[PDB]
Design a protein around this ligand. Structure first.
Ligand code: RDC
Ligand code: RDC
Lengths: 347, 506, 347, 506
């Protein structure tokens, strides 16, 4: 009784079968990889081929055969035949290898794993004034007890209906999420509140840039002082460790250096006292990472720079908990609202 | 005369080195008594130790060659030859004293005779001798002369000479003679029996004996005062100068000659026996200058062979490849010369950091002084990378032969060749014309290994993309095995784009 | 408009305030820690006290003040006063320290963090024929699209209503869960299917042993061949690294050694071929762990032992993916059903 | 007689050790010429080097003591004393040859006289001498005798003797004499000037000079044949045996005595001068046996003092604690004895693995043979853990004094005490009676450090549990600061359960 689902399971095959098919037995063909052709008639390249045109069919077959393949489930088709040649080697040897072959196909076609149905392994809750149909149900995201809905690793077959908010807020620590949630932030200041859980997964992403893109909702996110926190953010405006389906122009909301120290222009949020003991001093293995990023072509651009070296300079960071340990009331009806309306953040 | 106080110069410096000499003097000769008259030679070489206290040995050579006309026995061993009467056909053998020196050294330190035997071709009996010499007035004294009966079809020449030397000091160096002579002369059968009791037998590996060398008329550009005189006082009739300038030298036709008489400025119809000391010279000048003669004909020369070489150094090194080359003949100071060259590679040849160089002048090995040789230069000078060689250590061997009637030797009889430029260049190229045969074979080795490298890998890869690409066609589980094969072999053939082979490996 | 929630926020205080109160200024008192009294009048013990009677009040205050404290939020009350003594030290120095002081209180009272409201950091999905009221909503766990409900780190204020199943199935790999789920296992064989996500959290637990205890539902769980997989299990029948609110008599369901090799009694589940290449050979750093557990007082008991050394013996393990890569149909309507009805598992 | 060929026995083995001897002979004496007659002594000790080649020195002592009655000068230095006339009051000084030996050793190796000066108490002039000796017939020869005028209120005795020795070999050991004599004798003022030019001055730190020793009548249990004779032939009148057994010995009253005459079986009213050789013995027997006498009175003895000790070893070690003890007197073989003991701990005393032991016999230090001493035993035998000491290394010093008129020495004059049991036990206990004191002070050190350890920590912990416990009371933010204090001080007092103190630290 499957629907918008048996949509893709079709646009998949036909708009694929055709592209990988080349046969054309007039003259010797090759694939084109735009990011570099791969001639089957090479040496260094010979093996790289049989690997693509395999891990591919494995997909296309498991595709019409109504299966739901996980990436590893697919790695485990290394060695597919009995031995024809008695060399008196393996198809692929290490998952890493198999994966790359994916990503290559993934380009040749234009279709991202999740669209070919290879369903992977996703986490990341969400909650808010939002109503979707997923598969055969419509589940309302307000009415959720203290729990929370957790997206489906295929978040592209998921229809929006009624919405009610002005901004999406992406928080990184599951523990704090449970806090913002059991006060009621997302209802008081109409919003949708979603957490990743640390490193953002491959499709807690897609959800986000879909909110931001199809519903015109602005996205603020928040984590720790450290270079760690700057990273989370990085991923959210591109996709883990250098397609174009992750959201740029997301917004960084604190915790800011000046958040803890101030400017001659603007008051600090931390008491001089609390600060001496909440601040965890900077190990030098940290100051490395900073100086590596301070260089990334999408930090270099802004006066995002400003808030980097200020750190390179005060050698100091704090955990988000610390701040919230001031007590939800503050974190709820002061920090966010103040900062947000205040235009205190980076863009 | 001279060899009496200045020994070392003709090659008898000390006891030991003399042994080696006498040995390579007897072989040298015994061959030129067979292979030049067209018989498969069977030389036997035995050295014996007959007295321990004084260190006396007995070199002995026995052939199946022609032999000496009996009466000329004394005038071959006893008589001391002043000079090396200008040469007119290729021979083995340096100086102009040769085998004579051996007998002379023998009467200086020991008191035993020189046992000799000969029996000419188609001979009645075997004439035996046993000779000693009178050194003061140059004339040989016969101690014994007799003859017995010949057991049919026999002809040969047995020479037995006793000298003092040092076997152990020159052992390892003599063995190199035999060995190395064997190589370039495989139409022979050698046996060697050392004073200890060690026998060695190297067997005839074929019988394609090369063409022998032909005697030929002297060539103008390479003769002077001394000779002209002896060509004249060696005549029989009254030649005029004309005849004499024509029927006596290479290169001198009617019109070709007349102009020489215009130069030296001589009457043409003048008696020959009537030539003053100065008139002659005024001729030998214009000889030296005249521009266009022809080439000193090389019918007086003799070659190994672009094959006896191959075989020779194949049947003893057993390599993975061999090649040789015989050049066209060039010309030097009124005489002709040719350079032969060869190389062997891999297989059994010992792995070492540098190549082995065998030198050859006039069908005889040169052992001593390899370091001061015009050859040892070129083949160390040569850049072995511009010819294949990748590795640090490798197994290569190199054979360079040089022959003429006028071999330029560098120093006072010291067993190595002189740096005559025009020669050195034909020696080079010759090596290049082999060396670039080496690059070829080692270019078809990477080729032959490149096929079995691909064509092997593909046999593994064309079934897989075959199946895979077939599943894409018919989705239904029936064509799986039909579409399969009708493009497996379809694929397979698209491969004989590059290389053609049908191969079954099980 | 809070209810069964303002329940606890009361049974918390009153049945607490009383216990920690001792004052009784007749004679010098102490606390009793049954797992050992802690005399405030000691030396080694002096500091251990002020630490308990602090991290305690911090709780009790934040408790009536309608806050929702996370453990760290609480650690960040290290240094609470200005310096009274010029020593010309800190309250607590490392989170580890603070934590223990919790657990101690936790006993003195009889109440588990989650019951005092300290809400922690709770991730583990669930799905099935089950209906609960949570807080102010009733959310049905069948009607869930491809998503799935994610429990609340306070899973003790959560009422059951209509149930419909015969066993709960606890799977360890989120990726495989997404698979079992989008076929419909839990509906075909009426069940509730929940995954942890690796190491089981402190309250994806409580949920389970509450299903097992209050609804009489039998619990089968499955993971990898390795000693890793045996561990997951371990936690599930006690509580990470040696109260009595984790479930014993849970059930281990494969993947079993014989699962991959058989017995002279009973057929093996993989082909001889697939084995040569799916099995990942045993590193020796592994055979350690095994010999450590083969000793744990709750493995030693059973012929659980049997299936330990068989491994100590074949030095071999496989990943659950491997098996599933055989293709859901098999994993769905053969593996589980067969094993379960078959009594193939350990208890 | 004997010292002539057997030198080493009375303490003159070799050049060096003799220097040390002569020095400790002169001091020994000079004191007993002051502090025993009740004057604060001012001794000066200078050694000079007057000849380099032969190694000759000049020991020199100058006091403010009484001095010799002029006429007895020769009969003090020149005359050689056979024996050590049985002792009846405590003195310093081993043998019975003492200061005489020094002068004797001086006339054996060098040729210079012995400069002497004296001036009795309340004397007219200063009598000067300069003496040498006749060794063969025992009698001193006066080289010079004269007298000058006394610059008022002067009295003293200057002795100057020259001997050969080795300054550098015995230096570090002499300095220990002065030093260690100073400790137990702080009522004195010493100056020492070594041959190099190093001055040392140790100043009087008080003037509580102890009670001196009192001469006393011989005691029965400790006398025999030899003596009794000389008590008799040393008389002046006609004593009877009665009188004689009573008015001549310690411990012999009317009835107490009569019974001795019942034993030895003698008439009571018999002339004394009329006693046969055997009658005597029959007496000396019953002496030896008779059971109940009294104790050999110790008014013949002299003590340091339970304080001069303290001061002495306080003003030189500067410890963190000191203590001493003087026992009641016990008795040994007809003679009395007492043991004194002390210990000092901590402060400036050098940290080492073992304690320092200072030995004292009759107000004089003993330096040589500390290893074979009845004392070195006890204080190494003693278990120092049953008395406080926790550590491996520690700074303890121990002083043990022994005095009597009859000191048992272990070997032939070798500077250490004998293992007489009854003595050893009073030496033990004495140490225990201090050791359980040192333990006391070092038990109140852990105590005093234990308070400041708690009472310090608590001041930090009673405000916290205070606030905390108050928040629990009133939930509303008003009592916070009221409930606070009314149990802060409430708490605080509940602490004076164990220890009482009011402390403000700011
Ligand atoms: C007459 C023949 C053939 C001559 O053409 C050969 C050239 C030179 C020979 C010179 C000789 O001295 C004779 C001779 C020697 Cl020495 C010998 O050791 C071995 C031989 O067999 C002959 C010989 O038989 O000579
Ligand atoms: C009469 C005095 C005091 C006597 O009570 C002291 C005991 C023994 C002395 C014995 C002597 O031989 C005299 C003597 C010597 Cl040897 C000496 O080196 C230094 C001195 O000062 C005296 C001395 O002055 O003796």
């Amino acid at each position: 009784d499957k629907e918008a689902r048996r949509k893709a399971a079709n646009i998949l095959r036909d708009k694929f079968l055709n592209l990988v098919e080349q046969l054309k037995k007039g003259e010797p063909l090759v694939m084109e990889i735009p990011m570099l052709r791969r001639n089957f008639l090479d040496l260094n390249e010979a093996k790289r081929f049989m690997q693509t045109v395999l891990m591919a069919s494995i997909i296309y077959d498991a595709l019409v055969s109504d299966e739901y393949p996980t990436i590893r489930d697919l790695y485990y088709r290394g060695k597919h035949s009995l031995l024809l040649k008695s060399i008196e080697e393996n198809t692929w040897d290490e998952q890493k290898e198999s994966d790359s072959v994916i990503v290559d196909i993934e380009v040749f076609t234009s279709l991202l794993r999740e669209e070919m149905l290879i369903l992977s392994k996703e986490k990341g809750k969400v909650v808010g004034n939002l109503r979707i149909r997923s598969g055969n149900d419509v589940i309302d995201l307000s009415k959720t007890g203290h729990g929370a809905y957790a997206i489906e690793p295929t978040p592209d077959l998921i229809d929006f209906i009624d919405v009610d908010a002005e901004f999406v807020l992406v928080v990184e620590k599951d523990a704090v999420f449970q806090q913002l949630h059991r006060a009621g932030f997302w209802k008081q200041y109409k919003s949708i509140l979603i957490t990743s859980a640390g490193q953002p997964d491959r499709a807690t992403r897609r959800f986000v840039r879909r909110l931001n893109e199809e519903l015109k909702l602005p996205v603020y996110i928040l984590t720790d002082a450290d270079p760690y926190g700057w990273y989370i953010f990085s991923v959210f405006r591109i996709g883990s460790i250098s397609e174009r389906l992750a959201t740029p122009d997301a917004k960084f909301l604190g915790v800011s250096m000046g958040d803890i120290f101030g400017n001659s222009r603007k008051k600090p949020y931390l008491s001089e006292a609390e600060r001496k003991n909440y601040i965890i001093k900077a190990k030098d293995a940290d100051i490395k990472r900073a100086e590596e990023i301070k260089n990334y072509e999408w930090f270099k651009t802004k006066a995002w720079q400003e808030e980097i070296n200020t750190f390179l300079q005060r050698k100091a960071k704090l955990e988000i908990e610390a701040m919230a340990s001031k007590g939800l009331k503050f974190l709820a009806f002061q920090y966010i609202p103040e900062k947000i309306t205040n235009k205190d953040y980076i863009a | 005369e001279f060899f009496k106080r200045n020994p070392e110069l003709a090659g008898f410096p000390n006891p030991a080195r003399a042994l080696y000499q006498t040995v390579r003097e007897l072989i040298e000769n015994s061959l030129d008594a067979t292979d030049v008259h067209g018989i498969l030679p069977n030389i036997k070489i035995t050295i014996d130790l007959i007295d321990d206290a004084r260190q006396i040995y007995k070199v002995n050579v026995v052939d199946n060659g022609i032999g000496i006309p009996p009466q000329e026995v004394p005038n071959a061993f006893g008589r001391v030859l002043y000079s090396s009467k200008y040469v007119n056909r290729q021979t083995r053998g340096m100086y102009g004293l040769g085998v004579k020196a051996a007998v002379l050294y023998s009467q200086m330190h020991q008191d035993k005779p020189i046992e000799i035997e000969t029996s000419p071709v188609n001979s009645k009996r075997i004439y035996t001798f046993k000779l000693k010499i009178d050194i003061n007035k140059n004339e040989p004294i016969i101690v014994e002369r007799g003859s017995v009966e010949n057991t049919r079809g026999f002809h040969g020449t047995s020479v037995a000479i006793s000298i003092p030397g040092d076997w152990p000091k020159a052992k390892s160096r003599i063995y190199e003679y035999i060995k190395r002579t064997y190589i370039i002369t495989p139409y022979a059968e050698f046996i060697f029996k050392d004073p200890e009791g060690n026998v060695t037998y190297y067997p005839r590996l074929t019988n394609k004996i090369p063409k022998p060398p032909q005697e030929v008329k002297p060539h103008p550009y390479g003769v002077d005062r001394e000779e002209i005189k002896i060509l004249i006082n060696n005549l029989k009739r009254d030649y005029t100068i004309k005849e004499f300038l024509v029927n006596e030298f290479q290169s001198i036709g009617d019109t070709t000659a007349d102009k020489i008489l215009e130069l030296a400025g001589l009457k043409p119809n003048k008696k020959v026996k009537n030539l003053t000391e100065e008139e002659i010279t005024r001729l030998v000048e214009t000889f030296k200058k005249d521009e266009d003669f022809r080439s000193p004909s090389a019918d007086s020369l003799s070659v190994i062979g672009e094959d006896l070489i191959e075989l020779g150094l194949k049947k003893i090194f057993n390599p993975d490849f061999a090649a040789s080359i015989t050049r066209k003949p060039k010309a030097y100071q009124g005489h002709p010369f040719i350079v032969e060259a060869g190389v062997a590679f891999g297989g059994s040849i010992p792995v070492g950091e540098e190549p082995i160089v065998l030198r050859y002048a006039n069908k005889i090995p040169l052992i001593y002084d390899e370091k001061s040789d015009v050859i040892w230069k070129v083949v160390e000078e040569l850049d072995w990378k511009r010819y294949g060689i990748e590795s640090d250590q490798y197994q290569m061997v190199v054979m360079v032969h040089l022959c003429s009637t006028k071999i330029p030797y560098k120093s006072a009889g010291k067993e190595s060749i002189a740096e005559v430029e025009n020669i050195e260049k034909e020696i080079k190229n010759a090596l290049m014309e082999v060396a670039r045969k080496l690059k070829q074979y080692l270019s078809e080795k990477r080729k032959e290994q490149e096929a079995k490298k691909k064509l092997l890998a593909y046999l593994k890869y064309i079934p897989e993309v075959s199946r895979s690409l077939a599943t894409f066609l018919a989705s239904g589980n029936k064509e799986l095995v039909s579409k399969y094969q009708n493009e497996i072999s379809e694929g397979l053939f698209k491969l004989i784009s590059k290389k053609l082979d049908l191969i079954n490996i099980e």
